[PDB]
Design a protein around this ligand. Structure first.
Ligand SMILES: *[C@@H]1O[C@H](CO)[C@@H](O)[C@H](O)[C@H]1NC(C)=O
Lengths: 49, 49
């Protein structure tokens, strides 16, 4: 809708409860890089996000 | 006059239950078969809910 996130009406649905037997103190996210096919004369490596 | 006496209550003469039939497809056979576990020192937490 017009608002990106403040307005909404639903609920979050649980799926499965799982254990993790190790101490956790830090978290980090990942990302995916699409390989870019460049001309041989460029001689460089590039990615598109 | 009216005198109140011991209350009248009918006990249920039946007790029969209808349980689920298939659902989760053999809780112990998908990963442990009938009886097959790991070594002693591997006290892995494996609970099925
Ligand atoms: C699972 O156990 C049964 C008997 O308990 C036997 O067929 C075998 O050990 C296991 N099944 C398979 C397909 O290996």
């Amino acid at each position: 809708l017009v608002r990106d996130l403040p307005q909404g009406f639903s609920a979050l649905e649980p799926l499965v409860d799982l254990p993790i037997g190790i101490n956790i103190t830090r978290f980090q996210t990942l990302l995916a890089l699409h390989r870019s096919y460049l001309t041989p004369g460029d001689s460089s490596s590039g990615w598109t996000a | 006059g009216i005198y109140q006496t011991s209350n009248f209550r009918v006990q249920p003469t039946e007790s029969i239950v209808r349980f689920p039939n298939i659902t989760n497809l053999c809780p112990f056979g998908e990963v442990f078969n009938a009886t097959r576990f790991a070594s002693v020192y591997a006290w892995n937490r494996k609970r099925i809910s």
